[PDB]
Design a protein around this ligand. Structure first.
Ligand SMILES: C[Si](C)(C)C(CC(=O)O)C(=O)O
Ligand SMILES: C[Si](C)(C)C(CC(=O)O)C(=O)O
Ligand SMILES: C[Si](C)(C)C(CC(=O)O)C(=O)O
Ligand SMILES: C[Si](C)(C)C(CC(=O)O)C(=O)O
Lengths: 455, 455, 456, 456
């Protein structure tokens, strides 16, 4: 729509497209911060709407906001949650480090919309006001950090963790199914002593189980909300019960154990909870990177690699099955690693009463959660559930190796056993062929003595 | 549109939305790689279209493609360049590490579109074929790396460099204008010997000039194109003049000094050119971070900070002017730092004949170029051009410091000068008040001897 | 020299050294840079060998004479008697086999002498058959890594952290009544007390302590008993549990045998996670250190709200220039911890099949970070934190110089009017009171009684 | 002990040491970790002092007797006669003032003795007035950093890089006729020769060399003459150019005076950029090292296309297990360079106003990376690269076992038919020929003449 609406702020008037619900401040920011293409994540936008919804409910309970106004604001917030106004937040991540502009973005949209809901109009003659009504008892300084934690905790609880558990179950079922399949071990990439495929996979299972605990340990710090600390953390210009009540409200509407932060100065001055929580995520990325690599190397071939297992072929050189899911997973694991560095830099750069590197920090954090969650979900259903053993190749490899020589020690002594191994190695023979050439035992004795199942 | 079209590949048939120009392979990938929200950058998409346009022209010259087919394909590519099909590339960055799916994405769109252009229809009875005609003499392995370099070089030349030069000019004009303004120096954050504001700014100018040279030194390696090496770099299934001719064509249509890579094995097996080029970018980020911090600290206040300079106030506590542009710049500088780590990890992980971490590498690289280019452009027009000195504050600070005591040495000796400084420091007096209290010189002598302009 | 030998042949080792042929060969093959195994790791390795000897002895796999001699030799290493016997670079085999052998040879040769024997080829105790009994470089090195890691965190890092927290907590309490101007975006903001500002630092350290504590259980899991690939082949079924118990007893730390030896051998996950908490601490410390040096900046042209002890000599002609050196040392080491994390992440993500072979590099960075953080907190505490004092005059001067207090006037005079004097003060360069009186909107008496900064 | 003193008073320094009061004070204030200044940096600092003495002498600012004595003392440090005289930790003042003073005191005390004088308080040469004449820690430390950096790159890194390139170039030439199966996504792909594959490694190193060379000009710019804040206050107008010339002459490197001293003092930009090229080299080296160990994997259950020298002793009962140790050492140090870059980036982005104070940490990481890369390339070259040999039988076995060659049949038989035998071979587990003959689509003779792998 070409038609504009004249909206204004302390700096004056500015034209805002008529079909949009934002106001003067969002328009100015739009024209001043034309940097790249990254905008606030949908999850962050919703967490912000949830924050305003809770504040309005509590402001009402405290008699600070009229029931009518509070009711409309709450109704407008739910529409945002319903995903009806995704197009009303055009601001880039690269704005003021406090997230003030996005706070104002939400205030203007909620104000203009709540006004219409009350039978009013959008624009300067709106019935609900961005700062006076919607931002009542708040500050960008304590609101943005709160929305960050709400977004982060819910994402971890509802997206990441469930997917992690499902992948663990799948690998655990595989572990039990292949418990009896003996394969050759590999250390330093070299052939080594045997272990079952089930045991190898149990290592992957334990890794995921350990990661889950680590992620759980990071949750209580992210559950702490800054809301109530206002501008510098003192809680100036607020009702004494506000901080506790708004945290209770959020906990109630989300069903998550949110608590108000015991120290508001630590909550406004840093992003410590997220720096620590992301530390657990980069650990999960390192574990996943290893599991994904093991899978693609074990399935390499089909003739000139390892080929001990086969994985589902999902896309359209006969046996050339590219391990694409493994490639998407390893690539996103590198991304999480780099995201951690950007986060550490921003988290270490707070000054005095406020950390102004917030948009960037939350941008990287929510991206890593999405990547890890969707990545495991994709890897699980498009690869993990269909992992199968190439029993013939496995056995071929086992019998061609020199590692089974240890089974002969108790029967013929170390010296003769090592002699057999050396001969087979220098001459390019199998352990059996060498043993028989030397005449140290009969083929029947070899077949009875070398049982890989007793490794 | 709910209506589908039945398209197929080696794996079978799949429904594709009727209003879309992509085919079977793009649809399968769409359903297999639902990971996060990041898709290929517009710049990469265009570079890919440019690559196909050049290959078609050369295939024509070699008599490998009919003039009609080649002409249509070229015409379809220009529409992509004109930005008419931005909605035809829905694939995520998190796909096969070679960029095969995006290569196929471009092949299908170009095929279906060129078909219509020839008076045909889209779908299975298309006149132009994705692999046979559009991917003729190519492979995903050499095409994606080529599109990466075309995108990277043009972005550096047309976006980054021009903005860098403009910012340098602005700071250079400021340097000359404030050449005569003496201010207090600061080392370790402590007061130190004087220097002019013009000199301080010249340091910023030299930093930018040095960065430009470094960035220029990285350009020749990125100008090398892998096109012609095919699957493993041997150039199997290609015309001997193809590699040279396609590089010439691209150089001609872009006006950039593109050359075919002297070693195709180094070109397909690594992302070395970009790892090195991004090293120069993280250097520019470190320099910019410093310039941005200097600016915000020098302008801090308006009463309880430094306040030596004032910057344009761009948004709506009277003197409280938040240095928002400085905050957007410092935040993106941290992002470039983290991007470098993800890139280094992917670049170090190539295996044998191919590096399969490409989508992620190019995703991070183009983001850093956009961030740095738009960041300097924004910082320049919304802050740098309007930097002004608070001459009164500067002079106040100068006269209140103890650092000017050095001017008295040649007149009264080191011992008396240090005595004056110690007294002023312990008692909280100005150098003049202390000197007069001691009676070592007259006020007229002080005023004549301590001339900060001769630092 | 002396002539020692292995399967590859004989080689000359200096007569005055207790190491064998394998260590000598490595000394010639891995001449990379100057980094060697840190003392903490050397001790953790000796402790692993000491515990293995006791259990082997208990199971009847090793004779008392040999077991006791190996333990005695191990104790000498712990006593700092053999520091020059470990010349190997960190940049060796990724499994740490070289260092496992370095310990095996030194312990065997010395245990020989301890039994009235001689060092070298004619030794009574054997490095591989005796000292390395029931073990493998594969499960021994990871065990030594966890022992050194857990002990460094519990004995060095945690106590120093607690001490620094107690100091800043005292300061928070002592300056609880001093009101100062807040700063957001580096701009003048509403007031808070120096005590509240310092309590923020305190809360940061308290949170970090709990994060570090949550990482200890995974680090306490030991790989010993996993043997070559984690199956435990060639070990008594009670070996793994017994050796873990032995290690717990002699170190007084809650060590346990890893429930899954495959996870233990194939990864460095516990350390990747434990280090995540360390870089978390580095980000917090960087912030605290920066606040301190900025607050102490000056003496005349900065902020100068606090004063810190001057430790290094200065120039007679330049009194007042007190460079915040402890803050500079601390911020530099914090940048180092961040870089260390990246190196550890890359090595930790690179394991293949049954064994991660980036171990020497991972333990090198991990132990350095712990060393940096513990010594850094102690130094900053003793030479800076304990001496933080407020410059009460500047603090009040700035407070009464800012336009931020105009807020208190709003409740006594309309927003526009209160803001009116603020505009004049700002524009004319006057103070809130000067402008208020000059504008005749109030009197000195009522202004002073209205603008109460100590009431927030 | 001996009693030395400064402006803060006197303090006891061990009699057998040449350092003064300032160094002793720092020794007590900065007891952080175990890292000290590296020898290369110590030498670069002595060289800076030696050059400063000559110019001061030439300008008539210093007496011949003192100047010559200071230069003689400086040369003794270069000769390795005073390594134990620099005990200071890297984690000190961010400007490197402590280390500048450590050099000033050691040089003054020694120069005193050299003039028939005594070390300590009664010295004939003065650390601050004589040795530090016309200088400041601010412009001296950055100068020493560039001198050490440029020299390490030109003398150590570049020659080793060239050597490794020459070796791999020889191998590329020697194996130019050996055809092998290509691998993309870790899957069997079309053929290429071992020589072509190795030429890729060669091209990588050649490109890296030029990138490293492009970074040298900025590193050659010196800060000396910039003095405290870069203005050059208290220096003769010819000082900066003369001292740069002097340094160029005695080191034989193209050192020049920095055109803008403010950029020189306020940043570490040259090193941030030069190190970008180093991490670039680390990514390349990591890839080459991985290809080598994967290609040599086995001996029976891996790829096993090549063989590499066995350097460490193995087990008699386990012949064939050759762990790629040089590759492991190399990959670990490459991860280290990546982490180092992060630490350097953070310090380099943190300068404030007239001076960057993260210098000791930046030079610490930079010199380590150079050390790691140079020694790593030498070790990998001598103990691995020179000994790479192809296992011709396995290479052919794999080549004739893959279905990839079916491509050559297409030109002699329709796509579908050629693919038909491939399907059978794959499904039935037969070889291309076995399936082709069993399907009766051709004869042994025509198959062999059609499938020519050596014709790509
Ligand atoms: C209309 Si007025 C200016 C009072 C206003 C007030 C407010 O935002 O609190 C608005 O709606 O923007
Ligand atoms: C129609 Si067919 C299957 C031959 C085809 C061919 C091709 O893609 O080269 C296509 O258009 O997809
Ligand atoms: C002397 Si022998 C070779 C038996 C030997 C044995 C061993 O290490 O187990 C040694 O001391 O190295
Ligand atoms: C002995 Si005095 C104090 C003059 C002195 C002088 C100096 O350093 O310039 C020293 O050697 O330290």
């Amino acid at each position: 729509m070409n038609t504009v609406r004249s909206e204004k702020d302390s700096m004056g008037a500015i034209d805002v497209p008529a079909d949009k619900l934002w106001g003067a401040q969002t328009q100015r920011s739009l024209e001043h911060f034309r940097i790249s293409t990254e905008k606030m994540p949908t999850s962050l936008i919703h967490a912000l709407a949830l924050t305003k919804r809770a504040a309005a409910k509590v402001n009402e309970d405290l008699g600070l906001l009229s029931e009518e106004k509070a009711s409309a604001i709450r109704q407008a917030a739910d529409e945002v949650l319903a995903g009806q106004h995704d197009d009303e937040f055009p601001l880039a991540i690269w704005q003021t480090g406090s997230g003030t502009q996005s706070n104002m973005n939400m205030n203007e949209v909620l104000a203009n919309r709540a006004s219409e809901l009350l039978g009013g109009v959008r624009g300067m003659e709106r019935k609900v006001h961005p700062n006076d009504d919607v931002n009542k008892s708040q500050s960008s300084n304590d609101v943005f950090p709160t929305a960050m934690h709400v977004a982060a905790l819910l994402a971890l609880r509802k997206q990441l963790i469930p997917q992690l558990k499902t992948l663990t179950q799948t690998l655990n079922e595989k572990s039990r199914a292949f418990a009896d399949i003996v394969k050759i071990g590999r250390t330093h990439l070299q052939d080594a002593t045997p272990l079952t495929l089930g045991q190898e996979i149990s290592g992957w299972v334990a890794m995921l189980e350990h990661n889950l605990k680590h992620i759980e340990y990071s949750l209580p710090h992210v559950a702490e909300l800054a809301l109530g600390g206002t501008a510098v953390g003192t809680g100036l210009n607020t009702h004494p019960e506000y901080a506790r009540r708004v945290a209770d409200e959020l906990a109630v509407i989300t069903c998550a154990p949110f608590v108000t932060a015991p120290n508001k100065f630590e909550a406004l001055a840093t992003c410590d909870a997220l720096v620590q929580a992301h530390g657990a995520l980069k650990g999960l990325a390192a574990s996943l990177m290893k599991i994904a690599n093991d899978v693609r190397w074990l399935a390499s071939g089909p003739r000139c690699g390892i080929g001990e297992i086969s994985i589902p072929e999902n896309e359209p050189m006969p046996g050339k099955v590219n391990p694409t899911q493994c490639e998407a997973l390893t690539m996103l694991c590198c991304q999480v690693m780099g995201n951690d560095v950007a986060i550490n830099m921003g988290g270490a750069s707070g000054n005095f009463e406020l950390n102004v590197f917030r948009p960037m920090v939350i941008h990287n954090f929510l991206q890593s959660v999405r990547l890890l969650a969707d990545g495991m979900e994709s890897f699980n259903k498009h690869c993990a559930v269909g992992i199968e053993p190439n029993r013939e190749r496995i056995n071929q490899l086992l019998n061609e190796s020199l590692m089974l020589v240890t089974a002969l020690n108790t029967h013929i002594g170390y010296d003769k056993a090592a002699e057999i191994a050396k001969k087979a190695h220098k001459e390019g023979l199998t352990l059996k062929a060498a043993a028989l050439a030397l005449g140290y035992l009969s083929e029947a004795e070899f077949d009875s003595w070398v049982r890989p199942e007793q490794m």
